[PDB]
Design a protein around this ligand. Structure first.
Ligand SMILES: Nc1ncnc2c1ncn2[C@@H]1O[C@H](COP(=O)(O)OP(=O)(O)OP(=O)(O)O)[C@@H](O)[C@H]1O
Ligand SMILES: Nc1ncnc2c1ncn2[C@@H]1O[C@H](COP(=O)(O)OP(=O)(O)OP(=O)(O)O)[C@@H](O)[C@H]1O
Ligand SMILES: C/C1=C/C(=O)O[C@@H]2C[C@@H](CC[C@H](C)/C=C\CC1)O[C@@](O)([C@@H]1CSC(=O)N1)C2
Ligand SMILES: C/C1=C/C(=O)O[C@@H]2C[C@@H](CC[C@H](C)/C=C\CC1)O[C@@](O)([C@@H]1CSC(=O)N1)C2
Ligand SMILES: [Ca+2]
Ligand SMILES: [Ca+2]
Lengths: 28, 352, 28, 351
């Protein structure tokens, strides 16, 4: 099934990695 | 045991069990009073109340009633016994998710719970973690950019117009031909005419000229009565409103422009991904030609180089629920549950 | 008492807030 | 069901109950096999140290230290109390995981937490922002902390500490004809170190005072009632922390690693680090060390910059005390990793 999703979720970067990358705003 | 997945719509509640391909129960989110019955029970038929407005829970007393009905009549489960995933609207206020959290643990004593953003779950349902989702239900429309599984809250756009407004609008225009649809009851017939007969025009102003000079766009519809009524341009004028909210007096940009605006609010490096992964979800994305009209419109806005792809699953009135069912099935996810114990130790804040 | 310490801990920025200020490296 | 605080030193275990002002137990981190006893049972031939340079290195024996900690020292059942354990800065991931697995699977703790030693020292002093110099029996570290987070990229490790300083004291004592050589004798020397050593403000001036005056000389009485006398050995020995070359090392000294550590921090937080130098660990107990640090970082820092060294009298115990304070806190109760979370996530969760 979306076993596909599970593989992509482990490959995902940290929220922090993304805040650093300038992609995510931090959150106060 | 096994997790429950409940999708709280302004219009329909989708509820069931994680692992299933489809929600077990799908009932109007309404509570009917004297003149107390929830859902289908209330459908017959005397003040109907909607406890969720524009995706936001607004009558808590009545929402408790919807939840109780969900566990004890529809799902036939004991809530003390299953982790429960609930969905919320993008940008749901903090106090609200705190209140939803406390009700779960305190009124229903769920062992554990989780709160997901509808749109994220839609994306997951399509097998993606990156994408921009257009979610258009009964109460509200949102663009939600998501990258590597996180919604990007600064770039979320909200159009407060959706299926309900479009029905109301269809009732209005149906009068030009001499038809009167006015009451609550009549409006349900119109909702049905909407779902069966409406479509989005690829090129609006040309669709109008075709309707004017030919009767080739006309379709007819059998009522209860059953009188037969015919309609033409009203078929596409109605959902055209999503591209042109001024049709109903609104100042907002159309869904094509909010999609664009939403992408422009994101880091320039992820945009290509967004443009290549436009997921449409929600009942109001069901209109035929809606995919095609987005592609044309987003293509007129994006860099000429850019790959645009619209993704519109046939199950997309239920994507959200299906996303929660997938998510909550996951082995890895099982640690994500906020548990009763965690709750006693932190109260409602835990939910952020 | 370090009532002092519990005041200071309540009034502290997010890990994410600091990653985005450039103060922290992100957890990878 | 009060929380337990255990500070796993290379030399001393410090353990007790959260809420208390001081550790209930302070005993040597040793396991003795003959020809197993733990801690005090053990000093009373063939001692292993399970923790080396702040890192758990022998797990079987660490398991026995923990067991003695709960069942012998603290007199508690571990399945009955949340337990907070400390770790060394830059402790490897696999380590924290093994520590976590052991606590849950061998000792069935209901809940545990792992904290960085130096962060707790900082907390002990009622600060969330500062740079700690933590210097024990096995390792020395500089840990800058801002708003309560350690900044792991800026952490500096000097691998010399209390133990190496004793060892060096044994070697220099031979210049005057004293011979300290064995394990036993090294303990006499550790005592001489702790009663008589001190950090010179100006090393070369102190060497020249020593050379022309008998004023720096101090006697010490050995267990057998013989009296020895030392002079410049008193400060040659801990001078090693400022000049690791004394014992053949290529390392920057602690004044220099403090500075390097600050220099790896964002420039807008250095003011706060220079104004909050916390000293912790038994090896920061020498008389004069605060003074010498102050003079040494004032020579390195910008010239407008305000330098303050914080050195609590109880700093041999700051770490445990920080843990006692931390694990005491109402807001902290939610931060515990519970058994239930452990069953869901395996040792990973400790991250
Ligand atoms: N085939 C269709 N064509 C057009 N509209 C449809 C179709 N099917 C359903 N809709 C409309 O979708 C709405 C229900 O969609 P959906 O269940 O996604 O909304 P919801 O989740 O309850 O609302 P929201 O997310 O706005 O809170 C109703 O307005 C319905 O009329
Ligand atoms: N008054 C003192 N002067 C100099 N040194 C001292 C003094 N008191 C204790 N020490 C030294 O401190 C060391 C033990 O200190 P501490 O307990 O802080 O180390 P630890 O926590 O076991 O080690 P580590 O953090 O390196 O793993 C021993 O070397 C001891 O000789
Ligand atoms: C078949 C069906 C569809 C639906 O979308 O129902 C939901 C919920 C429903 C509740 C009132 C109605 C009388 C009850 C049930 C109809 C449920 O209201 C809607 O029909 C409203 C009214 S018109 C419209 O488009 N939205 C949407
Ligand atoms: C009083 C005391 C101090 C201490 O720091 O002890 C710890 C632990 C101890 C273990 C061996 C020792 C014979 C046992 C007990 C001494 C405990 O080794 C030390 O003394 C070692 C050896 S010399 C030195 O400075 N570090 C540090
Ligand atoms: Ca919805
Ligand atoms: Ca220590």
């Amino acid at each position: 099934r979306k076993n596909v999703l599970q593989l992509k979720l482990q490959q995902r970067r940290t929220r922090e990695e993304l805040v650093s990358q300038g992609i995510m705003p931090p959150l106060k | 045991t096994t997790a429950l997945v409940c999708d709280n719509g302004s219009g329909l509640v989708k509820a069931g069990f994680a692992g299933d391909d489809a929600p077990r129960a799908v009932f109007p989110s309404i509570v009917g009073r004297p003149r107390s019955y929830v859902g289908d029970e209330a459908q017959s038929k005397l003040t109907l109340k909607y406890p969720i407005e524009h995706g936001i829970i607004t009558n808590w007393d009545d929402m408790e009633k919807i939840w109780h009905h969900t566990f004890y009549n529809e799902l036939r489960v004991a809530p003390e016994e299953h982790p429960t995933l609930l969905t919320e609207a993008p940008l749901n206020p903090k106090a609200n998710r705190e209140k939803m959290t406390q009700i779960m643990f305190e009124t229903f004593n769920v062992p554990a719970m989780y709160v997901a953003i509808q749109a994220v779950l839609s994306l997951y349902a399509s097998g993606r973690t990156t994408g921009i989702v257009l979610d258009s239900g009964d109460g509200v429309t949102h663009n939600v950019p998501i990258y590597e599984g996180y919604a990007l809250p600064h770039a979320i756009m909200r159009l407060d117009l959706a299926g309900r407004d479009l029905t109301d609008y269809l009732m209005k225009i149906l009068t030009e031909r001499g038809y009167s649809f006015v009451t609550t009851a009549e409006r349900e017939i119109v909702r049905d005419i909407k779902e069966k007969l409406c479509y989005v025009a690829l090129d609006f102003e040309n669709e109008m000229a075709t309707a004017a000079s030919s009767s080739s766009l006309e379709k007819s519809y059998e009522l209860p009565d059953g009188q037969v009524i015919t309609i033409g341009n009203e078929r596409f004028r109605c959902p055209e409103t999503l591209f042109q909210p001024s049709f109903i007096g609104m100042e907002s940009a159309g869904i094509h422009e909010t999609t664009y605006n939403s992408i422009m609010k994101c880091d320039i490096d992820i945009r290509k991904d967004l443009y290549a992964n436009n997921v449409m979800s929600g009942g109001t994305t069901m209109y035929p030609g809606i995919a095609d009209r987005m592609q044309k419109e987003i293509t007129a806005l994006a860099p000429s180089t850019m790959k645009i792809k619209i993704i519109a699953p046939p199950e997309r009135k239920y994507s959200v629920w299906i996303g929660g069912s997938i998510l909550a099935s996951l082995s890895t996810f099982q640690q994500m549950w906020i548990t009763k114990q965690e709750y006693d130790e932190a109260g409602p804040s835990i939910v952020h």
